[PDB]
Amino acid sequence: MISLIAALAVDRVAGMENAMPWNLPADLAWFKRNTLNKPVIMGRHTWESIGRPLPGRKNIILSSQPGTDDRVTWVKSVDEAIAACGDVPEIMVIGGGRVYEQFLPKAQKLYLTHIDAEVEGDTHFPDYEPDDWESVFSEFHDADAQNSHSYCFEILERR
Ligand SMILES: NC(=O)c1ccc[n+]([C@@H]2O[C@H](COP(=O)([O-])OP(=O)(O)OC[C@H]3O[C@@H](n4cnc5c(N)ncnc54)[C@H](OP(=O)(O)O)[C@@H]3O)[C@@H](O)[C@H]2O)c1
Ligand SMILES: Nc1nc(=O)c2nc(CNc3ccc(C(=O)N[C@@H](CCC(=O)O)C(=O)O)cc3)cnc2[nH]1
């Protein structure tokens, strides 16, 4: 199956010109936890933002051009990306906006972190219809000494 994972501020804002204005180590731990040992598909901008291969995962980067880093796998279409993942239980799509919109119709599961941050950005998570998804897990966390905002983890499965 194909899954998306993302951190969403209010209005599904997912990305800005620069790094998001929050310190959320617990969310990064959730991200690692749910992606380790699985192929991860990302767009070139997200690859550049991360700045290195994510360890312990097969990193697959979408770009229309040949790759510029031989440590990771580079593909030029959604179907090539999927094929490059091989026979695995779960493919993780980790963004960014362009990539999320392409994969959402193919996806069976969403891993979302809802962040109580009323911020502005240039990249959003695609619209999804709550009636087409069953929420199977939810977990709230307040802001604390190590996390700048309150965050709520959710897992949704497509009906
Ligand atoms: N809040 C979160 O959880 C989260 C997660 C990931 C990223 N982000 C944020 O998202 C932003 C990036 O999103 P974005 O939409 O700008 O970029 P993106 O989706 O990361 O990358 C876009 C690039 O991917 C390539 N691409 C996408 N689809 C393709 C296809 N079908 N065939 C070939 N190439 C394809 C293209 O590369 P070429 O131009 O080389 O052809 C394209 O320019 C950043 O601000 C980042 O911080 C947020
Ligand atoms: N929930 C969620 N939160 C995010 O911050 C997030 N970010 C991306 C894209 N950006 C990033 C940026 C950095 C790292 C990263 O460095 N991750 C490390 C753990 C963090 C750490 O080392 O402190 C990792 O191994 O996964 C991952 C994804 C995709 N989906 C997301 N989904």
- Tell me the domain boundaries of the chain: 1-159
Does the CA dihedral 63-68-69-75 come out positive or negative? positive
* Secondary structure string (H, E, C) spanning the chain: CEEEEEEECHHHEEECCCCCCCCCHHHHHHHHHHHCCCCEEEEHHHHHHHCCCCCCCCEEEECCCCCCCCCCEEECCHHHHHHHHCCCCCEEECCCHHHHHHHHHHCCEEEEEEECCCCCCCEECCCCCHHHEEEEEEEEECCECCECCCEEEEEEEEC
Ligand 2 centre distance from Cα of residue 26 (Å): 10
Mutate which of 12, 31, 38 to test ligand 2's pocket (most atoms within 8 Å of Cβ)?
31
Ligand nearest to the CA of 96: 1
Which ligand 1 atom is the nearest neighbour of the CA of 6? Answer: 3
Q: How far apart are CA 17 and CA 39, in angstroms?
A: 26
Which residue's alpha carbon is at the smallest distance from atom 32 of ligand 2? 6
CB of 121 sitting under 6 A from ligand 1 = no
Ligand nearest to the CA of 5: 2
Solving technique: X-ray
* Residue whose pair of structure tokens reads 């963004």 in the numeric block: 95
> Do the bridges between strand 2-8 and strand 91-93 make them parallel or antiparallel, or are there none, so unpaired?
parallel
Ligand 1 centre distance from Cα of residue 46 (Å): 5
- Domain 1-159 classification at class level: alpha beta
Ligand 1 centre distance from Cα of residue 103 (Å): 12
